[PDB]
């Protein structure tokens, strides 16, 4: 008893009922795998600004 192997009939109108789920803007801002030298400059400054910010907070 053979059968129909495959058919794309209706498979594209199904996907447009709930439309193409675009990615959120948080997905475009990942910093994984970036340049190891760039990620070491960004870390070395964020630590520097935070240390001077927390010290000023402690002073007041």
């Amino acid at each position: 008893s053979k059968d129909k192997n495959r058919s794309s009939h209706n498979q594209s109108h199904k996907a447009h009922r709930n439309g193409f789920y675009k990615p959120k803007k948080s997905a475009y801002m990942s910093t994984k795998g970036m340049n190891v030298q760039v990620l070491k400059n960004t870390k070395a400054q964020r630590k520097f600004a935070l240390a001077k910010k927390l010290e000023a907070k402690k002073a007041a």
């Binding site: 199904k14 996907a15 709930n18 439309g19 193409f20 789920y21 675009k22 990615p23 997905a27 475009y28 990942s30 795998g33 970036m34 340049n35 760039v38």
Partner: protein, 165 residues
């Protein structure tokens, strides 16, 4: 019925341009890609090492990270019913600087030129200039006269049939 090879159906997709074989240019390896630029992926079959997948050939992506010998490029790939974010790492030989914003980046300059004058006219008191008009589709043309001194007429009628043999 096709196969599952990585580079299947590439008789005409990877073939080099006619009389374009051999080495690439020297501005391919000299353009400077900075993070946030719009570049176009174009698979180069001459350089096999690092050839991007054939489904990304011609897609436009944003440079997200510039590594010493490869340029990170992120594109949107379509899946069953959702759009995912793909983060490749393509060597500069396989990508081309896209000029999608060629028109946009020349509108910014025109506005910036005007706004520069408005900070001088206002300081010196002159009436400031108005910003450039926005772009509109081809608007309906108005009514215009036509002179009767440089005019000529050609009668138009259906043509009598002439046999082609």
């Amino acid at each position: 019925p096709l196969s599952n090879g990585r580079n299947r159906r590439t008789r005409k997709l990877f073939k080099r341009p006619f009389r374009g074989h051999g080495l690439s240019n020297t501005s391919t390896i000299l353009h400077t890609y900075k993070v946030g630029d719009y570049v176009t992926i174009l698979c180069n079959s001459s350089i096999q090492h690092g050839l991007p997948y054939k489904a990304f050939h011609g897609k436009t992506g944003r440079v997200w990270n510039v590594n010493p010998h490869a340029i990170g490029v992120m594109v949107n790939k379509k899946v069953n019913n959702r759009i995912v974010v793909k983060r490749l790492h393509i060597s500069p030989e396989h990508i081309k600087p896209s000029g999608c914003q060629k028109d946009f980046l020349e509108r910014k300059a025109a506005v910036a030129a005007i706004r520069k004058q408005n900070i001088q006219l206002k300081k010196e008191g002159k009436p400031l200039l108005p910003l450039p008009a926005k772009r509109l589709p081809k608007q309906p043309r108005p009514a215009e006269l036509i002179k009767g001194a440089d005019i000529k007429f050609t009668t138009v009628a259906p043509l009598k049939f002439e046999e082609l043999y």
